[PDB]
Design a protein around this ligand. Structure first.
Ligand SMILES: CCCCCCCCCCCCCCCCCC(=O)OC[C@H](COP(=O)([O-])OCC(O)COP(=O)([O-])OC[C@@H](COC(=O)CCCCCCCCCCCCCCCCC)OC(=O)CCCCCCCCCCCCCCCCC)OC(=O)CCCCCCCCCCCCCCCCC
Ligand SMILES: CCCCCCCCCCCCCCCCCC(=O)OC[C@H](COP(=O)([O-])OCC(O)COP(=O)([O-])OC[C@@H](COC(=O)CCCCCCCCCCCCCCCCC)OC(=O)CCCCCCCCCCCCCCCCC)OC(=O)CCCCCCCCCCCCCCCCC
Ligand SMILES: CCCCCCCCCCCCCCCCCC(=O)OC[C@H](COP(=O)([O-])OCC[N+](C)(C)C)OC(=O)CCCCCCCCCCCCCCCCC
Ligand SMILES: CCCCCCCCCCCCCCCCCC(=O)OC[C@H](COP(=O)([O-])OCC[N+](C)(C)C)OC(=O)CCCCCCCCCCCCCCCCC
Ligand code: HEC
Ligand code: HEC
Ligand code: HEC
Ligand code: HEC
Ligand code: HEC
Ligand SMILES: COc1c(O)c(C)c(C/C=C(\C)CC/C=C(\C)CC/C=C(/C)CC/C=C(\C)CC/C=C(\C)CCC=C(C)C)c(O)c1OC
Ligand SMILES: COc1c(O)c(C)c(C/C=C(\C)CC/C=C(\C)CC/C=C(/C)CC/C=C(\C)CC/C=C(\C)CCC=C(C)C)c(O)c1OC
Ligand SMILES: CCCCCCCC1=C(O)C(=O)c2scnc2C1=O
Ligand code: FES
Lengths: 125, 61, 55, 385, 93, 246, 385, 49
């Protein structure tokens, strides 16, 4: 499933005050139960990278964010192998759990979709 | 008749089942007192082989 | 443990000493087991039954 | 460079067993693979030694196995090892497969890795079954009868393929002898398939429990994982030892200690425990053709998972809804097995039918629906607009 | 040799990850560490934790399936006893 | 399925051979052989057992030799081609009461007494079942049971209707070792002897098992320790991040 | 890049069969290798199908082969193909080996390639022999007796290894049954060994008739050599067809149509034609121990050639003395074979002894001496000082 | 016997030839052994036992 699609559905729900008050609280509870934050990871760190879109995205990511993603991932593997969690004061806070890679992922998907569209354009005389 | 269940080949058990006939323990096919398929995966009735009578004996073949 | 440093002195045990020990172990262990086993079943074995028989 | 790197043969060993970069965080669930190689060896070795004393003729097969049990020095150890080993082979395979399911090991770029694994599973089922027929006990004969008849479901030629497979009017001397020849052959095809499995694994490497990349922190296979593999290898042997010496027939069927009889099918037939879930699925469809098609589909549906998993992250580690449903699937599978050991009676038939539904629905409905919902939840829980 | 296809894993020195900088690792030889015995007192209450977070995902689905099985079994037993031979003729065929 | 069809569940008797560290009771095997010869052998064969396997188990080399010689087996034809008989030797297999399946049925209302060589392994319940079947014949079948002519009732047998009548009665055997030959004592004996027939490797198998389990247990524990040592550097490894300046 | 290059499995096929750079000048002598793979397949396929109808028991083995001959549809085609195929397997192997000898294929950097080939040759001899014993004819029984006794020559334990191998007092029912089990196993070990042979060949590539480098002018395996291989594959099949249908027993022994007899050894024993040269060498040494040692040495001496060839150029193409002596060696080998088919009588025993001497002298004396002389001749024929 | 049919003799001729010989048949309802004439499936008998 593309991130363009995830955003469409997610934004629609986010705007309408009917669903926005019904869902978000459930989603927040879901995110806490997932527990990735206790390992020092941000959700965007969890996205599977073995595909062209994600490789383009990670390539465009500015230097400072890249070094940080690297530290978070290594730190996560080490904690996991020790079968512990990070001390609570090291957990990623909700304010920090920002979709930092998302804008690069969406830009790449649109670029990709356009090319797919243009390579297949029909012509009407 | 031939005691070969028409489903997957097992030999039906005598005087058992829900129709006073034979029952195949393999997948649960029930046959009646005429040897017809009444319930279960078996699609046909127990086949009848060629035979003739000769007094006190029958010759199957 | 200084008990180790007296025989091997800060070095690991070598294959030769391992193989040699294995041959010793195989015999000692088998006797220890067959013994304990037969004693546990005293009275049930053929040895024990043969004694109570006279022919 | 080191000799282990330059030599044509040693470099293969070096790249696969010594210097292979492994993700630092893999857990004991990643130890099942080596355990599967070990099982394959134990099956081949004990099998060849018994083949030296075995006769495939229908009039001698059963007695030759008894001959292996009573006269061959250490013969009973060979037979109980081979027999109990087959069971242990499946216990470990299911865990290997379940591990893959849970961590999204079947996902891109390891699809080829997953598909070759499905082929191996099929070949293993075929192998164990053929071996089962070689004992020529009561269960053997009827199993050989049922499985070969499975092909009569094919329209038009079906009954022909069957008389062909039998080499005669029924399961007889041409059947069991070809089954022995075949039981010996297939294990070497599994070995070749296992090599292709490993080749596919080597191009992208192992995944890990976090579901993300391992490229930032790897450690050599040699030392770390060689010694960790040793831990489970010994544990595996301890448990197998307990069955072989203390309870050799617990995983078998008493009916197989009775010579096959063409005229009498046992009053109660319970197939091998690892085939029970499939036996239940077959039994749940009151139609011959549809019955066999659905059973085969229970295996082929594993191929669909890379496409129906709509998630954006690999694995169930950080997914509440997916973990929950994963276990519904696991226990549903065990239930199917329990139903397979029961008689076709009232509460059981309907339970069998519902469990079968649930089994297929997991792959085709639950996973795609749940993964989509989870994708959205992950998004709206952090985006502020 | 022949050209090789692009993968998502390389080898030591060119593994394929992003350029690392700023991270510093430290380690102490296993030889200089306390012989295996300290995995208690400090590493005992910490353990079992990685199952207190999981058992629910396993217990509930297990519970659900155990009761379903027990129910159908007890019903079967009744149907084939004397008391239930009447209901058996009703639900059977 | 009705209880009458499944058969009454055999209870758990305390056999001296139950338990990881227990051997068969060879005195019981010996007695059991006598009960088999004097009672069962009349209708049951024991085709898979060879005379030689009795030596050192339940009888002496001499005793078995005498027993085998009481029977005749087909010998190799003479210098002229005419067939000839011969006494039995240790290499032979214990002979059965019938020459073929048809004669076996003729002598039993049409039923076929199965071979007892593997009987203990060829039935769920094992020893508990065989014993229970032998000592579980009631003088009269339960009320309402329409027992077919020539059949007998036994609750432990599936379907209740068995073609074998009760054959063990008190003191029908004179145990050579003096033991009181009650019906339960005899059942307890044959069953033990029948267990040995099916699992002759029993005693030896359990001895080898004890050795195997001790070594593997030790190896398993030792590997854990070795693994932890080899992993200590990675396990206690520590990281620090210092954001690089632009 | 092309899919055949990128796919994990197809690239192997591409690098070995399609894009593999071959020296433009190789001749038809380089076609024997593929012919050897073909032979291996024909042996495995026809063998498995016959195994379906074969019984290994000593009381049924001979008759089960007759059963394959008389009752199995197309059975005689299977047996004659398998039997005549073994012979053709050796005819082609000798040519493959001789080709290597003549062109210096055994030289550096292809030593590993040559050594693996020697191992394959040994495994093939062992395989054919075990198969020979499965017929259980007169020749079978005595062959099984002689070859297993070969081990009694070992001091102290020798006679023990023998009673062990037999599984009893003499060649009996435990012998033939283990021989069948073993005959089925070994061919798969040859297959694995053939893969290692190919791996070793791939690192430096094929040599060529000029004995020099091929790096300046190569052409793709695909098209050129695939179609050239087809030419000899068909020629090979035509000739095998002529024996199978028109003269199926010319390469066999009439004594094998007589069931094995423990009490009577045939008045005239002539082993398989491809073993004759070795049989003659054995017979030429009037001592038991030394007799078997010299025979085994007749095979192992092939390992010495990379060191005793003192030449500075690879191959005999441009070498007068070496070509001449190469053929003395070839015809000496044929002579040894002819001696093996004769009775141990006067002119023959001495001829056998001299031929054996010549055989070993080629590797240890003639080649090193001649190659040195040729080196010098090459020098003084052009240097003017 | 069957291999002779269509080769050197007719189906009928071979049937007559085979029936002139006796072979061991399956035991009767009571267990006593009994003989039987030959059929096409049998193998040509030899002069000695
Ligand atoms: C009639 C039905 C009969 C059923 C038959 C049973 C089927 C048997 C067939 C297969 C048997 C061999 C398979 C062995 C491996 C399977 C277990 C597995 O993969 O668990 C991984 C799992 C993952 O562990 P991890 O996250 O990588 O480990 C962190 C360790 O603490 C990291 O620590 P460490 O490396 O430093 O040391 C680790 C640990 C390593 O211990 C091990 O041996 C490896 C893991 C085994 C856990 C025990 C499994 C129970 C099997 C019985 O060593 C220990 O000190 C732990 C001792 C645990 C007790 C084992 C039982 C002794 C019984 C004596 C008899 O280990 C578990 O937590 C086990 C969960 C239970 C699963 C059972 C489901 C199977 C049914
Ligand atoms: C009781 C004892 C029984 C003994 C049993 C016999 C053993 C049989 C087992 C193996 C049989 C299959 C093996 C076939 C290949 C073996 C021959 C070989 O490697 O010679 C290469 C050798 C090298 O040729 P080249 O330098 O690469 O070729 C340049 C061609 O003119 C370049 O020209 P091209 O590619 O443009 O066309 C080439 C040629 C290619 O022809 C071929 O088929 C390939 C080479 C075969 C030559 C004939 C060998 C005789 C085998 C009988 O096609 C032709 O037009 C030539 C026709 C030659 C007559 C073949 C006989 C027809 C007989 C019908 C029955 O070819 C020969 O000169 C043959 C010399 C004779 C050696 C016999 C020693 C074996 C004993
Ligand atoms: C894969 C998931 C596994 C599903 C298997 C669970 C089956 C356990 C069934 C319990 C049962 O009644 O077994 C009866 C069966 C047979 O019952 P049955 O054969 O006695 O029923 C009637 C027959 N007579 C009259 C002779 C008594 O026992 C077995 O063959 C299996 C027991 C071992 C199961 C192995 C699971 C280990 C993992
Ligand atoms: C490798 C080099 C091959 C050497 C083989 C040449 C052997 C030809 C021998 C001629 C001969 O007398 O064979 C007799 C042998 C047997 O002779 P013999 O068995 O008849 O001698 C006495 C036996 N009685 C009394 C029964 C007659 O024939 C064979 O088995 C071999 C013939 C085919 C050779 C295959 C070579 C093809 C390449
Ligand atoms: C002939 C008069 C018998 C004597 C003496 C004994 N047995 Fe028997 N037995 C006999 C028959 C006709 C049958 C067939 C029963 C049937 O309905 O099929 C049997 C069967 C058994 C069995 C198998 C029962 C089963 O579970 O299928 C056993 C275990 C058995 N018999 C044991 C047994 C022993 C140990 C005996 C001596 C103490 C004995 N039998 C005597 C006929 C006769
Ligand atoms: C010839 C070599 C050989 C190989 C290779 C082999 N087997 Fe067997 N197998 C046998 C023989 C012989 C028997 C019959 C003896 C027996 O019952 O154990 C047998 C029997 C079996 C049985 C029946 C066990 C029982 O209850 O008696 C199973 C199941 C089985 N094999 C599984 C396997 C599996 C799974 C593999 C490989 C992955 C395998 N075998 C490989 C020879 C082999
Ligand atoms: C089971 C598979 C099987 C394989 C694999 C196999 N064989 Fe055989 N082979 C047999 C059987 C069965 C026989 C006995 C039937 C016969 O005589 O042809 C036999 C017989 C033989 C014989 C005796 C031929 C004769 O005179 O009857 C030889 C020689 C032989 N094999 C060689 C080989 C060689 C060489 C290979 C492989 C490179 C091979 N076999 C592989 C099954 C096999
Ligand atoms: C239906 C699937 C499937 C089957 C069956 C299968 N595998 Fe795998 N195997 C996988 C997948 C997927 C992976 C990748 C695991 C990962 O990295 O997450 C894998 C990985 C492996 C590994 C790497 C270590 C590990 O356990 O993760 C080995 C070794 C291996 N398999 C061996 C085998 C052998 C041997 C067999 C059976 C004879 C086998 N596999 C059968 C799916 C399968
Ligand atoms: C004792 C030696 C030896 C034996 C036996 C041997 N090979 Fe070879 N093989 C060689 C050598 C050396 C080469 C290299 C030839 C060259 O390039 O000059 C070679 C090359 C090859 C080639 C390349 C093409 C050719 O014919 O030159 C193939 C294919 C091959 N071998 C297959 C096989 C197979 C299949 C077998 C048998 C089952 C086999 N070989 C047995 C020595 C051997
Ligand atoms: C990327 O991740 C990996 C990983 O790649 C690997 C490789 C492993 C380690 C595990 C393995 C390599 C398992 C491999 C298993 C195999 C290759 C098995 C191959 C199988 C066979 C059956 C070989 C065939 C054997 C024979 C032909 C011979 C047997 C018969 C004999 C000796 C008969 C002898 C006769 C007589 C008379 C004496 C990991 O643990 C792992 O985890 C992270
Ligand atoms: C550098 O130079 C080269 C060169 O490299 C190559 C490769 C070749 C070409 C030749 C080859 C590649 C030969 C290779 C041969 C092999 C790899 C053979 C491998 C052998 C096997 C026996 C495979 C094993 C087969 C099986 C397990 C299956 C058979 C059994 C079956 C199908 C049973 C089916 C059962 C039923 C019931 C239907 C050249 O000609 C050459 O010359 C210049
Ligand atoms: C994937 C293949 C699953 C195999 C299902 C067949 C199971 C199966 C039956 O359906 C059957 O009726 C009998 S009778 C004796 N054994 C069996 C058996 O194993
Ligand atoms: S075979 Fe009778 S129901 Fe399946």
């Amino acid at each position: 499933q593309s991130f363009t699609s995830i955003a469409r559905i997610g934004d629609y729900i986010l705007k309408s005050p009917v669903l926005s008050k019904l869902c978000v609280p459930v989603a927040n509870q879901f995110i806490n139960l997932a527990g990735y934050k206790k390992l020092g990871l941000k959700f965007d760190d969890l996205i599977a990278e073995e595909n062209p879109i994600m490789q383009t995205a990670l390539r465009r990511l500015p230097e400072d964010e890249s070094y940080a993603r690297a530290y978070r991932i290594i730190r996560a593997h080490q904690t996991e192998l020790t079968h512990h969690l990070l001390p609570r004061n090291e957990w990623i806070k909700a304010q920090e759990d920002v979709p930092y890679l998302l804008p690069y992922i969406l830009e790449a998907e649109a670029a990709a979709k356009e090319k797919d569209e243009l390579d297949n354009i029909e012509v009407s005389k | 008749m031939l005691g070969i269940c028409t489903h997957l080949g097992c030999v039906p058990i005598g005087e058992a089942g829900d129709f006073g006939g034979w029952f195949c323990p393999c997948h649960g096919s029930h046959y009646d007192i005429s040897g017809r398929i009444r319930k279960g995966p078996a699609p046909l009735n127990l086949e009848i082989p060629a035979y003739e009578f000769d007094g006190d004996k029958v010759i199957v073949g | 443990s200084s008990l180790y440093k007296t025989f091997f002195k800060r070095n690991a045990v070598f294959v030769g000493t391992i193989f040699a020990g294995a041959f010793v172990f195989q015999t000692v262990f088998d006797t220890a087991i067959t013994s304990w086993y037969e004693n546990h079943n005293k009275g049930k074995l053929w040895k024990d039954v043969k004694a109570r028989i006279a022919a | 460079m080191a000799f282990r790197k330059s030599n044509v043969y040693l470099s293969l060993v070096n790249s696969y067993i010594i210097d292979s970069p492994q993700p630092s965080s893999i857990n004991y669930w990643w130890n099942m693979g080596s355990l599967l190689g070990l099982c394959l060896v134990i099956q081949i070795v004990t099998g060849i030694f018994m083949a030296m004393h075995y006769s495939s003729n229908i009039e001698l097969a059963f007695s030759s196995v008894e001959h292996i049990m009573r006269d061959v020095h250490n013969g009973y150890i060979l037979r109980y090892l081979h027999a109990n080993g087959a069971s242990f082979f499946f216990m470990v395979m299911f865990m290997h497969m379940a591990k893959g399911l849970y961590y999204g090991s079947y996902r891109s770029p390891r699809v080829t890795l997953w598909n070759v694994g499905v082929i191996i599973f099929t070949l293993t089922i075929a192998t164990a079954f053929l071996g089962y027929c070689c004992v020529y006990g009561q269960m053997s004969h009827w199993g050989a009868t049922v499985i070969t008849n499975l092909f009569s479901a094919i329209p038009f030629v079906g009954n022909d393929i069957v008389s062909w497979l039998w080499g005669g009017f029924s399961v007889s001397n041409p059947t069991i002898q070809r089954f022995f020849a075949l039981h010996y052959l297939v294990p070497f095809i599994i070995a070749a398939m296992v090599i292709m499995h490993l080749m596919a694994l080597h191009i992208h490497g192992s995944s890990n429990p976090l579901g993300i990349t391992g490229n930032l922190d790897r450690i050599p296979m040699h030392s770390y994982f060689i010694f960790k593999d040793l831990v489970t290898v010994f544990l595996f042997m301890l448990i197998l030892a307990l069955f072989v010496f203390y309870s050799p027939n617990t995983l078998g069927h008493p009916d197989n200690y009775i010579p096959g009889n063409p005229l009498v099918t046992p009053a109660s037939i319970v197939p091998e425990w690892y085939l029970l879930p499939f036996y239940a699925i077959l039994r749940s469809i009151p139609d011959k053709l549809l019955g066999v098609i659905t059973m085969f589909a229970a295996i082929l549906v594993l191929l669909v998972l890379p496409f129906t998993d709509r998630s954006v992250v690999r694995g169930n580690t950080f997914k509440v809804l997916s973990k929950f449903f994963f276990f519904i699937f696991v226990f549903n599978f065990v239930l199917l097995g329990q139903i397979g050991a029961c008689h076709v009676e009232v509460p059981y038939v309907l339970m069998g039918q519902i469990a079968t539904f649930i089994y297929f629905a997991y792959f085709l409905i639950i996973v795609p629906v749940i993964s989509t919902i989870e994708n959205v939840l992950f998004y709206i829980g952090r985006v502020n607009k | 040799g022949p050209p090789s296809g692009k993968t998502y894993m390389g080898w030591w020195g060119h593994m394929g990850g992003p350029k690392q900088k700023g991270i510093t690792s430290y380690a102490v030889s296993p030889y200089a560490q306390k012989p295996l015995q300290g995995i208690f007192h400090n590493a005992v209450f910490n353990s079992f934790r990685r199952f207190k977070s999981q058992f629910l995902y396993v217990l509930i689905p297990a519970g659900i399936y155990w009761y379903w099985w027990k129910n159908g079994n007890e019903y079967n037993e009744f149907l084939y006893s004397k008391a239930g031979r009447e209901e058996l003729e009703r639900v059977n065929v | 399925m009705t209880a009458a069809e499944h058969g009454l569940h055999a209870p758990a008797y305390a056999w001296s051979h139950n338990g990881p560290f227990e051997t068969f009771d060879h005195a019981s095997i010996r007695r059991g052989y006598q009960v088999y010869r004097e009672v069962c052998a009349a209708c049951h064969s024991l085709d898979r057992v060879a005379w030689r396997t009795l030596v050192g188990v339940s009888h002496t080399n001499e005793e078995v030799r005498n027993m085998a010689e009481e029977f005749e087996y087909d010998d190799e034809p003479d210098e002229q081609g005419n067939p000839k008989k011969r006494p039995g030797k240790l290499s032979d297999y214990i002979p059965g009461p019938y020459p073929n399946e048809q004669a076996a049925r003729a002598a039993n209302q049409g039923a076929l007494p199965p071979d007892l060589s593997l009987i203990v392994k060829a039935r769920h319940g094992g020893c508990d079942y065989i014993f229970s079947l032998l000592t579980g014949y009631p003088d009269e079948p339960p009320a309402g049971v329409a027992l077919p002519p020539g059949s007998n009732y036994n609750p432990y047998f599936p379907g209740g209707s068995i073609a074998m009548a009760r054959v063990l009665f008190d003191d029908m055997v004179e145990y050579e070792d003096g033991t009181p030959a009650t019906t339960s004592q005899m059942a307890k004996d044959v069953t033990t002897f029948l267990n040995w027939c099916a699992e002759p490797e029993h005693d030896e198998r359990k001895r080898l098992g004890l050795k195997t389990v001790i070594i593997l247990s030790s190896l398993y524990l030792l590997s854990i320790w070795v693994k932890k040592f080899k992993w200590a550097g990675i396990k206690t490894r520590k990281f620090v991040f210092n954001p690089p300046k632009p």
